[PDB]
Each structure stands twice: as structure tokens, then as C-alpha cells.
Amino acid sequence: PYSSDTTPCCFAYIARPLPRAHIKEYFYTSGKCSNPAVVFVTRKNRQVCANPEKKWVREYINSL
Amino acid sequence: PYSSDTTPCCFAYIARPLPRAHIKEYFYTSGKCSNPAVVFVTRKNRQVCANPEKKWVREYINSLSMS
Amino acid sequence: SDTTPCCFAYIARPLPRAHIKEYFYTSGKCSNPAVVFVTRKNRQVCANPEKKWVREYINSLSMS
Amino acid sequence: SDTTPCCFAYIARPLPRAHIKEYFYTSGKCSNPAVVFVTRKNRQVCANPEKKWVREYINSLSMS
Amino acid sequence: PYSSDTTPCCFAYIARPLPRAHIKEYFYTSGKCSNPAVVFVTRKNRQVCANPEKKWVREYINSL
Amino acid sequence: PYSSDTTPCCFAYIARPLPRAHIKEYFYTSGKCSNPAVVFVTRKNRQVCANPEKKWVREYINSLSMS
Incomplete structure (x- = not known):
């Protein structure tokens, strides 16, 4: 850990x-x-x- | 209340x-x-x-809070 | 002792x-x-x- | 490169x-x-x- | 290879x-x-x- | 003629x-x-x-052989 600012974390995936x-x-x-x-x-x-790890996520990143 | 939204977390304290x-x-x-x-x-x-846990933090919350 | 996999070259x-x-x-x-x-x-x-592609793949994968 | 198994200790x-x-x-x-x-x-x-038992076992085994 | 004497070799197993x-x-x-x-x-x-590699061979060696 | 008997082999030549x-x-x-x-x-x-293949070997065989 590094700063007093908040940082966005995820606890569930769409x-x-x-x-x-x-x-x-x-x-x-x-x-x-x-x-x-x-x-x-x-x-x-x-x-x-x-x-x-989801394919659509990867495909979006790769294409966008 | 687990959703897909991001949630702000803290890793250090001012x-x-x-x-x-x-x-x-x-x-x-x-x-x-x-x-x-x-x-x-x-x-x-x-x-x-x-x-x-800091006193100043507690004092400030108590001044802002409507509870 | 059990074996462990080692690498000597990188794809x-x-x-x-x-x-x-x-x-x-x-x-x-x-x-x-x-x-x-x-x-x-x-x-x-x-x-x-150290390779960028390697790092990008790791970010999308689970670790055994 | 493919991995290869290495040993660090001997039973x-x-x-x-x-x-x-x-x-x-x-x-x-x-x-x-x-x-x-x-x-x-x-x-x-x-x-x-180098162990005698190891050598004796090898003599009775096939090698992969 | 090491000597002019003959040495016994095997080409089939009982x-x-x-x-x-x-x-x-x-x-x-x-x-x-x-x-x-x-x-x-x-x-x-x-x-x-x-x-x-045959079990009976191994059992004989071990017992004798 | 593959059997279980041992067979003598050679690895060097006098x-x-x-x-x-x-x-x-x-x-x-x-x-x-x-x-x-x-x-x-x-x-x-x-x-x-x-x-x-040695000449002496061949000469000796020829002296022993009944063929």
C-alpha cells in the first residue's frame, strides 16, 4: 500500500x-x-x- | 450489496x-x-x-453527523 | 524432494x-x-x- | 521454451x-x-x- | 566398449x-x-x- | 532362435x-x-x-573349417 487518496476496487464482475x-x-x-x-x-x-479473464473482456480490450 | 460498481478503498491514512x-x-x-x-x-x-480511531477523526464525524 | 519446473529460454x-x-x-x-x-x-x-505482452497476458489470467 | 524438471533436494x-x-x-x-x-x-x-539404492532401482526400471 | 574377452548378453527374457x-x-x-x-x-x-523389471525377478533378488 | 540363453558378444578385437x-x-x-x-x-x-576381416583370422578359419 502507498497514498491517503481513495482508489477504486471491484468486488463483483458484471x-x-x-x-x-x-x-x-x-x-x-x-x-x-x-x-x-x-x-x-x-x-x-x-x-x-x-x-x-472473460473472453468478451479480452476481445474488447484487444479491439478498442 | 455486492454489485459491479467500483467502491473506494483506502490504503493509507492522512x-x-x-x-x-x-x-x-x-x-x-x-x-x-x-x-x-x-x-x-x-x-x-x-x-x-x-x-x-483518531480523536480528531471522531470529533469531525460527530460535528458533521445528524445521528 | 519433488521436482520443480525451470526455464532456460523464453518464447x-x-x-x-x-x-x-x-x-x-x-x-x-x-x-x-x-x-x-x-x-x-x-x-x-x-x-x-519483463515483456509487455507477457505482463498483459498475466493481467487477464488466473495463476496456478 | 518448454519447462524442464529440476531437483534441489534428494529423498x-x-x-x-x-x-x-x-x-x-x-x-x-x-x-x-x-x-x-x-x-x-x-x-x-x-x-x-550416487546412492547405492538409487543405482539398484535404476537397474530394475525402464527410463522415460 | 573395453576387452577382447567375450561377454554374455541377453536378447530375450524367460x-x-x-x-x-x-x-x-x-x-x-x-x-x-x-x-x-x-x-x-x-x-x-x-x-x-x-x-x-519383472516383479518376480525383483522379489528373487531382494530375497536371495 | 531368440531364446533365454546368454550369448557371447565381442566388444574389442585382439x-x-x-x-x-x-x-x-x-x-x-x-x-x-x-x-x-x-x-x-x-x-x-x-x-x-x-x-x-583380418587376413590371419581368415587363414586360421580356413585351416580349422571342414566346409
């Missing part, structure tokens, strides 16, 4: 793929967090936690 | 009291987080992690 | 993510550090831990 | 011959020389090549 | 166990030979080639 | 001709053996491996 077209960016959550996660940021700026 | 005058709100971090924490939100919207 | 071309099931790091007893990717047919592939 | 008590299916020598790439006995449950057991 | 009681000594054939073998020497001094 | 006078019999080693050889049996029953 079940249904989000539409590819609705995603504006992604990031991986901090290594400080207990679980690994991809966060997708939608065009409406919602942050959505997703399982880095 | 060393010095923040000025009371600059704080507008607080909240506690989720119990899912590995460490307990209070977060103070400043008027400039910075979120500052703080040690729940 | 040159990235193998496809789709063919990998998990990874692990080789033992610190080994002379070289290495990531091992375990394929669908359970072949163990040694890879250079 | 103290002889395991029963009846439980061993085959042996092999570890790679010369490994830092220590070793005989590996492969048990009926496919556990790999490292053993000291 | 199918039926010899009676334990009829064996006076054993030896392993030379490493120069292409196949490994146990030779049992009977009380009548017949030399009988046997498979070192 | 460097110098044996004295003809000391040899009573010969035979060839089995084709199963990795190297070809002639074996001379001395009157004292030593078996001596010899290179089949």
Missing part, C-alpha cells in the same frame, strides 16, 4: 457483456485491491467492473 | 488533521475493503482517507 | 491468448526467472517476465 | 520399488544432477544419483 | 518364473550389451536371462 | 595374432550382437575375440 459501442475507456484496478478487475467506463461515465 | 473548515462531508469505506477508513470530502471535492 | 513470438488456460511463476530456486503459460493441451511455455 | 529414505513406474535423469541444464523416480500416482521424486 | 529354490546366484549383464538383463544361474549351472 | 598352435576351435558370434566377431577357443579354453 454478468452480461456491456455493448462494445457504449465503452469509452478502460483501466485495470490498482494492485492494492484484493481482486483484479477491468473497469469499463461507459459514454454516460458509469464505471463497470468486469472479470479480466 | 498524517495530520485536515482543517475542519475545509470539510463538507464524510463517509466510511465499505466493509469489503481490506482496511477500515473514514473518508473526508473537502470543499474542492478531494476525498481524503483517515484513520477511524 | 520469441507471443502465443495466442485464446490457447492459454493459466500461468505461474517458476520457483526462485531456478537459475532464471520465468513466467510459464499453460496451454489448453497442458503444454508449459516459458516466457520472459 | 532421505528409499521409497518402495513396488510404487515406482519409471525413472529419468534431470536435464544437464539444471544446477544439480538428479534421478527422478515416477510413482504409480505420477509423483516425481528426486533422488541422489 | 517367460515363466524359474523356481526360487533352483537359483544359486545372479548377475546383471554388462552395460556394453544392448539390452539390460538379469542372468540367474541355476543349481545345474544353466544361465537364464530374465527381465530386470 | 591386436596381435594368437599362435596358431594354441587354437583348437572357432565360432562366429551371433548376428544379434552389435559387432561382428570371430571367437578363437584356445587349448586352455580361453575365448578370444578377433576381427573377422
